[PDB]
Amino acid sequence: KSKSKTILVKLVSQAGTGFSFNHKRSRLREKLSLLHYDPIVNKKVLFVEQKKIRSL
Amino acid sequence: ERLEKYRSFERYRRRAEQEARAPHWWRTYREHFVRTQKLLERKHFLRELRANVEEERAARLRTASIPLEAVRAEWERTCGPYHKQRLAEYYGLYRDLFHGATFVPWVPLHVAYAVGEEDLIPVYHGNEVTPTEASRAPEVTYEADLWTLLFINLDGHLLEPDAEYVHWLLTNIPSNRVAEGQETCPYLPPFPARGSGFHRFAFLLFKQDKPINFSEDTRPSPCYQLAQRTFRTFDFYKRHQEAMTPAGLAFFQCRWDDSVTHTFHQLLDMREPVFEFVRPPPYHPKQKRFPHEQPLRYLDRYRDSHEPTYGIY
Amino acid sequence: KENEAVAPEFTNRNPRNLELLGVARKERGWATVWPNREFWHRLRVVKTQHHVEAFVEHLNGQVVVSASTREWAIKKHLYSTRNVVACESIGRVLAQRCLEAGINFMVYQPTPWEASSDSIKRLQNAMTESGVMLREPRRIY
Amino acid sequence: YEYGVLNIHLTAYDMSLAESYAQYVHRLCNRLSIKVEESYAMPTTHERVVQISGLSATFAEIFLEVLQSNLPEGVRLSVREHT
Amino acid sequence: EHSPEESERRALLLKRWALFKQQEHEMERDAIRSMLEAQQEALEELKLES
RNA sequence: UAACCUAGACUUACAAGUCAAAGUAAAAUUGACCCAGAUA
RNA sequence: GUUAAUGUAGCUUAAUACAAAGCAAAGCACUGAAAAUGCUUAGAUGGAUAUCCCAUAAACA
């Protein structure tokens, strides 16, 4: 319970489609910018972290 | 501890491979799924090579080259037939042609399909030659001093699997000249069916002790009937096994081509056959009235028509 | 017309019929053993210290094309056994036989140190320039 | 009965100097058809061990002659029978 | 920087250098075996005597 | 992003989630569902 | 001469065929040493049969 290493965040598409998915990142690292498949545009687009959900 | 321990992986790998090759009591994968004067001359030439300083230095530069053409000709004379026999065995010619009988080739047979006049494409063992390149009969040359040469399409038959068709058969060939051979079978261009894969065509040379009239094997010229081109090598060779001993081989693989369309229609005068490779239907367990713990896709697996039906409605 | 008669099903007996088409089966198991066996053909180079021999073998275990430095034709024109120049020529000779044999696609499985070797990288260079493909195409399902 | 395994502790004021003899003595040891199970290094001068297994009266005489000749410079030899 | 001829000469002397060391080691390597066998042969001789 | 599909199995109130031959397709310190949210 | 040895390359009962084989052993490069790896080196049927054979060398002599 006390131990806390990673965190869960929302990765939101930069294409404006509103598609989002959750990914795990280390708490002490910088915000993630990832290239992920967006079903709405049916092609890989850049995703940027917006908010933290919980402590993993 | 008395035995030494391998200092490198290679020593273990080489020993392991040798151990695998040797049979063992325990079940293994393989069972389930499977003169003097010349030597003195050779040494003398080798010693001359040793003496040559240029060759010595040519090797320290680690760029020395070898003439492939000289090696190829010499290789055929000395140990090439053993390699040639392996090619036929792997390709299944012996099992399909002579019902498993094996003959070591001895005649260095050479065949090439002439393209125009500038160059001629050779026909080696297992080579790939397009049907267009085989539109006309090839040039045959071999060093010898009678002879009979035969042409086969081993897997080109369209009616009977065991049978095969002759492209052309020359008989009573005197020494090297081939123009004097009797044209029992007129030349026919390759006709491998579309979508039927790669067809192997093999050229056979048989030593003739005495001239024998092959009246039974004579065929009308020109002949466009497959029903009369059908034959068997085994029985044909059995009838003439007394005076025929095979000594030459040459085979190539060819696909379907636009020229094959011409061959089927223009002279064969029949519709071209078209085949497709059909894989076995996927295996599905017997359908259950209640597919417990199964997705909705379960119904789709056992359905045949993708269009809705209404029955009484 | 008598010609028009054709059997519904073709019966091709060529062992390489499906392999050349690319539909023939390749062994896909043996995950716990090295090297992988998902090859229609394999290049086996056994340097056996002094002499260098190269083999081409089908999955069934029958060697198809073999080039060895002991062979009289090569040795008379070949100065010395296993070395950088050993595969500089026999590999080229093997390639010509491979082209002669019609095997354009083959699989080579060298070890890490062997791959880093000098008499193997040049052998691969000799094969690729000759047009022999050291990587076979993927099977068609 | 046969000679036991005798260890030679290459003791020198420099680890490289003992290394230089360790490289050569071991090189000659293999030339002497000797088996070297281990090559231990003592704690700080620096001393290095070159295990030698398999000796004989005649072998020792030929071996010790080689060991003396192999002495490059300022290295102190030692012969001790293993426990 | 060494010229290719200079490297060529240095490489050559390594080749003969390799041969010289090889011959000495082979003769010296086998000499040891005879001496060890010779001592064992003498041990057999004494055993025959007593 | 770490897939889908599909023999045969696990886990499980239900549901979802797992392992996996074949097939196909991208590429080369919690754990689901219910149930409530956010919005469309 | 009687007993006895010894005769493919350190080892092998590799081989006599389509090789006179494999292994051991050797040098340099590569820096802890060693080993590995890469590049390199040197070699034989003194000889037969499926026991004679001559040579060689011992106890008897």
Coordinates of N, CA and C in Angstrom, one line a residue, chain D residues 7-12 17-18 21-22 24-26 29 42 47-48 50 52 63-80:
Chain D
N7 N 51.5 -25.9 -6.7 CA 51.2 -24.5 -7.0 C 52.4 -23.6 -7.0
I8 N 52.5 -22.7 -8.0 CA 53.6 -21.8 -8.1 C 53.0 -20.4 -7.9
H9 N 53.4 -19.7 -6.8 CA 52.8 -18.4 -6.4 C 53.8 -17.4 -7.0
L10 N 53.4 -16.8 -8.2 CA 54.2 -15.8 -8.8 C 54.1 -14.5 -8.0
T11 N 55.1 -14.2 -7.2 CA 55.1 -13.0 -6.3 C 56.0 -12.0 -6.9
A12 N 55.5 -10.8 -7.1 CA 56.3 -9.7 -7.7 C 55.8 -8.4 -7.1
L17 N 54.0 -7.3 -13.7 CA 55.2 -8.2 -13.8 C 54.9 -9.6 -13.6
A18 N 54.1 -9.9 -12.5 CA 53.7 -11.3 -12.3 C 52.7 -11.7 -13.4
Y21 N 54.9 -12.8 -16.3 CA 55.3 -14.2 -16.2 C 54.2 -15.2 -16.2
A22 N 53.0 -14.8 -15.6 CA 51.9 -15.7 -15.7 C 51.5 -16.0 -17.1
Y24 N 53.5 -15.9 -19.7 CA 54.6 -16.7 -20.3 C 54.7 -18.1 -19.7
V25 N 54.7 -18.2 -18.3 CA 54.8 -19.5 -17.7 C 53.7 -20.4 -18.0
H26 N 52.5 -19.8 -18.0 CA 51.3 -20.6 -18.4 C 51.4 -21.0 -19.8
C29 N 53.7 -23.7 -19.7 CA 53.0 -24.8 -19.0 C 52.2 -25.6 -20.0
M42 N 46.6 -13.5 -5.0 CA 46.7 -13.2 -3.6 C 46.3 -11.8 -3.3
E47 N 50.7 -11.0 -5.8 CA 51.2 -12.3 -6.1 C 50.1 -13.1 -6.8
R48 N 50.5 -13.8 -7.8 CA 49.6 -14.6 -8.7 C 49.9 -16.1 -8.7
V50 N 49.7 -20.0 -10.3 CA 49.6 -20.7 -11.6 C 49.6 -22.2 -11.2
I52 N 49.7 -26.1 -11.2 CA 50.3 -27.1 -12.1 C 49.9 -28.5 -11.5
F63 N 61.1 -29.4 -16.4 CA 60.2 -28.3 -16.2 C 60.9 -27.1 -15.4
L64 N 61.7 -27.4 -14.4 CA 62.3 -26.4 -13.6 C 63.3 -25.6 -14.5
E65 N 64.0 -26.3 -15.4 CA 64.9 -25.7 -16.4 C 64.1 -24.6 -17.2
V66 N 62.9 -25.0 -17.7 CA 62.1 -24.1 -18.5 C 61.7 -22.9 -17.6
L67 N 61.3 -23.2 -16.3 CA 60.8 -22.2 -15.4 C 61.9 -21.1 -15.2
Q68 N 63.1 -21.6 -14.9 CA 64.2 -20.7 -14.7 C 64.5 -19.8 -16.0
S69 N 64.5 -20.4 -17.1 CA 64.7 -19.7 -18.4 C 63.6 -18.7 -18.6
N70 N 62.4 -19.0 -18.3 CA 61.2 -18.2 -18.6 C 61.3 -16.9 -17.7
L71 N 62.1 -16.9 -16.6 CA 62.1 -15.8 -15.7 C 62.5 -14.5 -16.5
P72 N 61.5 -13.6 -16.7 CA 61.9 -12.4 -17.5 C 62.7 -11.4 -16.8
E73 N 62.3 -11.0 -15.6 CA 63.0 -10.0 -14.8 C 62.5 -9.9 -13.4
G74 N 63.3 -10.0 -12.4 CA 62.9 -9.7 -11.0 C 61.7 -10.3 -10.5
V75 N 61.4 -11.5 -11.0 CA 60.2 -12.3 -10.5 C 60.7 -13.4 -9.6
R76 N 60.1 -13.6 -8.4 CA 60.5 -14.6 -7.4 C 59.6 -15.8 -7.6
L77 N 60.3 -16.9 -7.9 CA 59.6 -18.2 -8.0 C 59.3 -18.8 -6.7
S78 N 58.4 -19.9 -6.7 CA 58.1 -20.6 -5.5 C 57.4 -21.9 -5.9
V79 N 57.7 -23.0 -5.2 CA 57.1 -24.3 -5.4 C 56.5 -24.8 -4.1
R80 N 55.2 -25.0 -4.1 CA 54.6 -25.5 -2.9 C 53.6 -26.7 -3.3

